[PDB]
Ligand binder design. Structure first.
Ligand SMILES: Nc1ncnc2c1ncn2[C@@H]1O[C@H](COP(=O)(O)OP(=O)(O)O)[C@@H](O)[C@H]1O
Ligand SMILES: Nc1ncnc2c1ncn2[C@@H]1O[C@H](COP(=O)(O)OP(=O)(O)O)[C@@H](O)[C@H]1O
Ligand SMILES: Nc1ncnc2c1ncn2[C@@H]1O[C@H](COP(=O)(O)OP(=O)(O)O)[C@@H](O)[C@H]1O
Ligand SMILES: Nc1ncnc2c1ncn2[C@@H]1O[C@H](COP(=O)(O)OP(=O)(O)O)[C@@H](O)[C@H]1O
Ligand SMILES: Nc1ncnc2c1ncn2[C@@H]1O[C@H](COP(=O)(O)OP(=O)(O)O)[C@@H](O)[C@H]1O
Lengths: 362, 362, 362, 362, 362
DNA sequence: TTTTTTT
């Protein structure tokens, strides 16, 4: 009998696998007998136990084959081909809707019967995130719409505040909610060349902790990031296509993606201040610090950094009609799921605990 | 049965794909039944629904095949071969006539029944651009004439002026009309060679926002760009061929393209001013600035940066005889469309609105 | 029924193609029917209409083939193989005699019944070049002997003088007459390897617009050229075989070509001054500018740079006996055309016009 | 009806080709019929008229074949394989004996009645060059003896002296008398990897114009060469096998060959100074230059640089027993044949003409 | 029939052949008949006449084969693979056994029937070193066993003395008895990290001429070398694995090799003094200089500075039963050779005349 | 792999 190359390519497509060694290893685990597989019976990894039943007959023949890495390469090139087709043909609203579909799939497993996580612990995360800024759910929705519409010169937001105020916490959650990357522009103009190359085909970027110079009475390290941003003005404005470089690969011409700049209270040049739409001032708050000392599980599970928490915030607060037409069905299912388990009185009691600096789940 | 490699090569020539991954992704999705195909029913992308019914039989057999990327690589070689043949054998008037034909195909789709845009928005763009410089249609035409003749020494145009003065708006629109690339020569010398390699076979080059030295006299940043340009003087003149390189590929010998330099008001060494045949001064105009803020659809849809707008300007103002004899019959059809859907009073009112800082549609 | 690889090899040999993409593109055009081809009926490019009828049957079999680039790579290597054989086996007099035959073939097509060139406009170029230096045909003939005899350490010529004085003009014309490559040595030492590799198997090199270190008090830019070139002294002499390099290919060992160095009034080290035979000083001549300004057809058609203009000068002034024995019989045919289509007096009027700063033709 | 790969390998062994494009070009010329072959009738090159009649039948079938470059690779590999066998298994005296046999075969054909050269002008070469130094012919013998012994850590020679002093013409003459390759180590140390790779299985290495640090006040610019050699100490000592590299081929483990360094008057670090066995320093002379001005055939025909001129000198001054025993019978034929024409009285007269600066002839 | 690839691999294994083109070249020699072979009758090399009778049948088929280099590549990979199995097991004793095997075989040649120098020069040098330092025949055997055991903290020996005392000249011979490299730790601390990386995967390290501070009190130059070395605590002691990096490579983790420090007479901080297991003081002796001056061939043949002189000393004095139980048989022959080629009394005569300051062969 | 990256 012969290997079906078509069944391998299907598995790669449905697993969304970019990687020749990961695919090869995953697929070789299907050769052992289905009826007695310990990895199925512990139900431990979803990308195994959902597929082993189908692929056993092909995996047995594949284990005898001589072509193995050649079969996996064609499968991986098919998955890479779809990504490139999508990048050039989807509108930004569809890219975001696909990303929410990926997140909702992970939530269904994570809060399912074999799930590890309590939904009570993640709703405590929504209560703590809501106290970080005024009107958080509007701020998150304004951010999403701004990244979708991508209007020239209305592309970037500035996060400003003392050390330990929440800047990296909120930024990391937005990066997970709509996939993106972090950049470090504090380097010399020499090395920036490959640093800016991380943004190739990304939806969103964050410039993390850019350092100015001067203001030394404030007790701040000096660096050159603000000078660099002032020379990188064209990338922030975004009217024109710029050349971007990865190590060993040819230059690509792109409209550089929108993003977030985080900084301490360094002085902005009047030039740079004008490229931003909004600045959000973060300030330290004593009640939130006392709360985290008495609700450690938020930090230790990394709940407050995670985009699943921001999505649960959006699901609770925003009306169904703001979401795109195809995802609305999953959302009304998830709303009814949540309203059945959290009474509004319990959620207001969670928020009242956070405002008092007491532990959330008393 | 066996795959027809000839039909794949035919598809690549009709859609003009250079990317092997993009061609592979496109061709695979034809494998599903044409009678049901959702993107054909939705009329989503012209690169798909115009072809699916023809290629369906071959795409099913291609999905079974074991040398898919060898098939796609040969098809991409075939499209590259036509580009190099056309580059050595066509006169620059024919190269430009072919670029106008591509744009007019986009305009037929874009302003047809399937398309999203409409003419009164984009024609207000042509009214806005005409207020930027005196006699804009003569300046655009005289530029096109210069680039087609490509006379040595008498070859490059210099745009200078304060920030927010429309240099990059015009330069990006001229770039989109002719086709070409933007280069950032502000770099260190040891990596300029790969930057200049982006010019290979292009029709235009635009050297964007080159920094000088001595800017503190004006409160301007400092950078090497103007000194690098003084070392590249051989590339600007175009008297003799230069050697250009892409990463991992052997050097190619050709005459460097003509084009545009944009800069802030640095002092220019007189040996470089001797090499620029025309200098166009841009200055702040407050009425243009007020008009954009009240007419922001001009930015949100990128109407003012786009070469389709400049071609509509040429169609409105130029007499039919100045286009090459091949494309004239297609242009009189467009003059008829525009003179049907508009009147002089409508366009005279749009320019009247701009000149008073009123909204262009008021 | 199978492709004959020998027919493609003949076509490549008769056409002299060095790159695989160009050979592939040319040959794929032959698959369409000979009885209707528009490119044959217009007689537009001579590489097509002379060969299509012979190759058509094979081209349709080539278009079905699974192996196309492999076929073309063998054919291109066969053309490169002949050029390597001749570079070891021929004397330099025969190399130049062959290059003159190639030029005289182009002159038959340019000035034939089926081409655009006007012999009066090209003989107007001879008048302008004959004014640039005194005794111009003596200079051209002494240059040619220097390149043919290739006497060690007496091989290079130096051109000095202001910007806009005819030095790059005459260098480009000599470079087309002999054939060769133009090289840039103003970049730093560490990437010169692949630049000097452009000189492999060539007859001439021209080092364009070399920059010195000093002279800044004259308002002349500083750079690395003369420092680099003083390290390269071993390449200039041609007493010893050097090692030359291209990407992915092994070291070639050969004597480096003779050539021309061009520069703008920098001072030169005594070690470099010892390795040039003759220095030519160019000083601006006002009447040549006012002539050229009224004679813009010279620049558009590039006549004053073209090697054909110096070959026409040699046919006008030199005796017949001092061309090689096989090419004399074609030169005497060209002597007769020029004495039929011009008198002396029409040529003497043109040369008087150039002295007067009037347009060359009147 | 198959191509004989055996016959191609025999042609490469008899011609001793070591480049694939050259062998391909040479073998393809044999496909045309033997009878009418214009090159065989004129007898232009021995590598053609010796072999065509034998190889014709195989070359016609080679011209139909489609593996052509793989056939030539296996033939060139066979020739490179034999040189490595010789390089290990021959006695080092016999390698020099073999190289003289190659020269003595080549010297006989060029002084044949069919040859272009003549005895008196090449003996003027012997006269001029023996005048260049004190006791020249015994200095050449001392060099040959030193290289033949190759006593570890007692190999290399220095030369030192200024421009136009004579060092490089002597080094070039020795290089052709032996087998050898010139190297340029003035480039930065990390690039030298493939430069040193040329010495693989060579007899002599010569380092030409190696530059020190400082001394620039004499108009002798600096470079990395001497610091490189002090790093490359392990290769001069060569008491152990070094590892030498070339592109896409398995690397060679070998002792680096004996050789010569030529320099201008730089300082030498004591660590490097200790490696060189002998230091034959140079001084300029004036009547020799007066003679060359009047005797231009010497440089035109490259008489003074060639190893044939030193071999004519060693034939002149050396006793016949000092050579190897196989060539002893050839050397008496050249001793006699040379004396039979060129008597000592006329030799002394023209040697006086050099000494007096007259110009050598009569 | 077909080629046996295993017969080729047997020849490569038994010849211990490391290199593809060398294997190809030697195996092709077996094409011709065994009975007639001229090399077999002369017996010039063992690698031919031992095998030709056996391998002739295969070599007749190998000559017709169309993929000869692939056969040889597999054979060489088989010999190279066996060296990496042996790397698994090498105890540091067995490293020194085979390091000696490589050096005796070069002694067998150089002093042999086909030799190049006579032991009467070498033995007077061995007698000279046997009076440079007290009891030195015991020192070298003790030194080597410290290196073989590589006991932590017991690793390093300090050679101290004023200039011209014998330090560098003995360090050369010990480094050539072992294998290793020298390091120059006088560099500023920034550059030391790359210098130390040269020790990657080696048996021995030698540190040369560490500059102190305060040595100007005796006109000694001063520098950081001692202060750098005092800070390399973990590299000297050898209890823990340390990181090493070459330029352009990733960091390697290993125990740092043992070694020798040679020092120009400065003071040593008592921290650094605790790192060295034994200190050797070298002192000027004028009778050693008079001896050298009256025996200058000792230096000019470089008798003193070789691992050959130290191995020859280990042969003379030490007993046989302490050499490894395999290699000890090869010292039987060099003992009996020396005991008969040289006189037990003549040694004492030349040590006497050395100590007398008389010429060592007088 | 070589080149590019690294230095
Ligand atoms: N608004 C706040 N008030 C008090 N503590 C905070 C606040 N936001 C965050 N923290 C504390 O600071 C830690 C780090 O927050 P992060 O956002 O990573 O720092 P930064 O604001 O400097 O980027 C959190 O884990 C939490 O313990
Ligand atoms: N005459 C003008 N006066 C003031 N602003 C202008 C004028 N023309 C264009 N603009 C502004 O130019 C902006 C485009 O950027 P641009 O000025 O071209 O950048 P740069 O000057 O760096 O090339 C537009 O967003 C618009 O607001
Ligand atoms: N006699 C002259 N006076 C002024 N300009 C001249 C003269 N001769 C040639 N030129 C100019 O030389 C230009 C070409 O450059 P050229 O002077 O040959 O080299 P470079 O600019 O490097 O010195 C032509 O476009 C032409 O305008
Ligand atoms: N005595 C001499 N007479 C004439 N020319 C000489 C003499 N010595 C050297 N040369 C010139 O220098 C070249 C090589 O000698 P060398 O002293 O090495 O010069 P360079 O230092 O320029 O290489 C010769 O080929 C020749 O052109
Ligand atoms: N103990 C000694 N007494 C006198 N001269 C010596 C002594 N040791 C070496 N020499 C001489 O000193 C020269 C330099 O030796 P070297 O090892 O460079 O000195 P150092 O001990 O400073 O390293 C030797 O070549 C030798 O001629």
């Amino acid at each position: 009998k012969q290997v079906s190359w078509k069944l391998v390519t299907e598995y790669a497509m449905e697993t969304k696998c970019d990687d020749v060694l990961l695919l090869l290893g995953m697929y070789l685990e299907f050769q052992y007998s289905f009826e007695m597989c310990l990895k199925c019976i512990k139900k431990e990894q979803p990308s195994h136990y959902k597929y082993h039943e189908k692929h056993y007959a092909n995996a047995a023949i594949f284990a005898d084959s001589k072509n193995q890495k050649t079969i996996c390469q064609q499968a991986v090139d098919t998955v890479l081909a779809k990504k490139r087709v999508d990048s050039l043909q989807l509108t930004r609203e569809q890219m975001l809707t696909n990303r929410f579909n990926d997140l909702l799939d992970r939530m269904d497993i994570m809060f399912g019967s074999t799930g590890s996580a309590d939904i009570e612990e993640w709703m405590a995360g929504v209560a703590w995130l809501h106290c970080l800024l005024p009107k958080m759910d509007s701020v998150v929705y304004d951010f999403l719409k701004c990244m979708v519409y991508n209007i020239p010169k209305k592309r970037y937001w500035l996060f400003k505040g003392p050390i330990d105020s929440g800047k990296t916490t909120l930024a990391a959650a937005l990066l997970e909610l709509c996939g993106g990357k972090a950049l470090n522009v504090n380097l010399p103009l020499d090395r920036l060349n490959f640093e800016l190359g991380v943004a190739i085909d990304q939806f969103l970027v964050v410039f993390e902790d850019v350092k100015g110079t001067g203001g030394e009475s404030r007790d701040l390290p000096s660096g050159q990031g603000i000078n660099n941003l002032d020379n990188l003005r064209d990338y922030l404005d975004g009217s024109v296509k710029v050349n971007l470089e990865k190590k060993h690969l040819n230059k690509r011409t792109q409209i550089f993606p929108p993003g977030i700049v985080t900084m301490n209270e360094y002085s902005v040049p009047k030039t740079l201040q004008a490229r931003f739409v909004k600045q959000i001032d973060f300030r330290p708050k004593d009640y939130l610090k006392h709360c985290l000392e008495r609700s450690e599980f938020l930090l230790e599970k990394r709940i407050i950094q995670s985009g699943i928490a921001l999505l649960l915030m959006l699901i609770w607060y925003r009306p169904v009609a703001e979401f795109a037409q195809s995802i609305q069905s999953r959302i009304v299912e998830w709303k009814e799921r949540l309203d059945k388990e959290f009474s509004l009185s319990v959620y207001q009691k969670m928020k009242f605990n956070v405002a008092m600096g007491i532990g959330v789940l008393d």
